[PDB]
A paper describes a structure:
In the last decade, free fatty acid receptor 1 (FFAR1 or GPR40) has emerged as an attractive diabetes therapeutic target with both glucose-lowering and weight loss potential. A G-protein coupled receptor that responds to dietary long-chain free fatty acids (FFAs), GPR40 modulates FFA-stimulated insulin secretion in pancreatic β cells and incretin secretion in enteroendocrine cells in a glucose dependent manner. Based upon the disparate pharmacology of these compounds, a widely held hypothesis suggests that aside from the orthosteric site for engaging endogenous FFAs, GPR40 has an additional two distinct allosteric binding sites: A1 engages ligands such as TAK-875 and A2 engages ligands such as AM-163810. Here we report the 2.76-Å crystal structure of human GPR40 complexed with compound 1 bound in a second structurally distinct allosteric site (A2), located at the receptor side facing the membrane lipophilic environment.
The structure shows that compound 1 is highly lipid-exposed and does not participate in any packing interaction in the crystal. This extra-helical allosteric binding site (A2) is a lipid-facing elongated hydrophobic pocket defined by transmembrane helices 3–5 (H3, H4, H5) and ICL2. The A2 site is located in the non-polar region of the receptor, so it was unexpected to find compound 1, a ligand with a carboxylic acid moiety, binding at this location given the penalty of desolvation upon binding. Single-mutant study of Y44F, Y114F, and S123A in GPR40 shows that a simple change of removing the polar hydroxyl group in each of the three residues resulted in significant mitigation of the downstream Gαs stimulation by compound 1 as a result of reduced compound 1 binding at the A2 site. The stabilization of ICL2 into a short helix by compound 1 (and presumably other A2 binders) could explain the enhanced G-protein coupling to the Gαs/cAMP pathway by these compounds.
Residue numbers in the entry: 3 to 32, 39 to 146, 168 to 211, 901 to 902, 1002 to 1161, 1903 to 1904, 2214 to 2278
Amino acid sequence: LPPQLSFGLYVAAFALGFPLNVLAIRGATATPSAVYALNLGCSDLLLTVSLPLKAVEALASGAWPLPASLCPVFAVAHFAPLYAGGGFLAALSAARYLGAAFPLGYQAFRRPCYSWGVCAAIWALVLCHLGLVFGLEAPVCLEAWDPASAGPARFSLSLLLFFLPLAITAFCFVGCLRALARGSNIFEMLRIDEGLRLKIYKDTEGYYTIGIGHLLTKSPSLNAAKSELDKAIGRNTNGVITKDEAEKLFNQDVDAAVRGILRNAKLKPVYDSLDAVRRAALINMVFQMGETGVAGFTNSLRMLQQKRWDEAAVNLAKSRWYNQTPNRAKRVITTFRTGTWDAYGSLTHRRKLRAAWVAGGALLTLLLCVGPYNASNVASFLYPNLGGSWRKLGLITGAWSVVLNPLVTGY
Ligand SMILES: COc1ccc(C(=O)N(CC(C)(C)C)c2cccc(C)n2)c(N2CCC(c3cc4ccc([C@@H](CC(=O)O)C5CC5)cc4o3)CC2)c1
């Protein structure tokens, strides 16, 4: 409440803000998360540099110690990096959400230049919106109430530059929570193991293959492969397909791998007794080897039916399958043993957990720092009875985003 306490809290924010954000930048410079943390660290620095001036203003109970014409420029130089901070948190939470909810789809669509593009658009939108609004409608500075005529303009700032990022961050945090519960499925697992190629290639066994691990023929003839490919799609392809056609063959093959297990007497008892994750591991095998091949793993299959996970793991490792494709086999074996997705880097529960925490941290620091000011500034044009201490507090909490913001990124 007293101006001396206001002064101190700003100084604390500066004093904590400066090192923490330089440290943040180095941590980011040592993926989309890094880009957003880097731009957040920079906007935090610009905000930090304006704090000494913000602090002396609070100490003088609102008195602006500089020429009145510099007040609009300082308003931009202070609020610009402030609002940008919010948007980066919103962008970062979006990247985390997309990574958590749609790992593979995200990774396919994602390009490094988009992250910068998004960041640029944020800087652009913020400075254009603030520069115009504060430039057209501006000895007291930031502590002063805005005239009721400046309402529509200042409201558009809060609406667009805070409330919208907030709502989006809230969506991303809820989506992240949902992603945790959703875990992962067999389609994602096989997409990682088989990869994606649009040209005809040879697998580790030397057979002609296309798409997401679709076996074309066991024949050594490339022309027989090109013939079987045109059968599978019903169109002359000449050894090249689209992503859409690949995904269609993928669902048919997963279906075929499942139906193969369903009609197998030696595979079906195990399939029936497993959970979905351990089921996914079985399907992966039958996808790679076929039903008869996997049916011959008599020992391992029996141990899996009796929930003897460790024994089964050790057994499966003695196979030709393990020696020919070790990385893939180890993942499928780990899946079998644990019944989790721990073996799959971009599908793991922890990765989804970190996204939830980043988004949650982001949502909270948006609510607590940039939140209170905008909530009270819009509530100043309505309700002419509003107390002055609400906006003054909001400016303090907003300043503290230079402390909170670097913490949520984890660098
Ligand atoms: C700081 O003030 C603001 C104000 C308004 C918004 C704001 O709401 N808008 C306005 C609009 C929706 C009506 C256009 C806004 C503005 C700039 C850029 C964007 C994308 N949106 C805003 N936002 C919120 C959504 C954010 C976002 C969504 C999003 C989705 C994918 C991604 C990428 C993740 C990555 O980098 O990998 C993925 C690759 C594509 C990055 C992404 O970043 C960007 C910042 C920030």
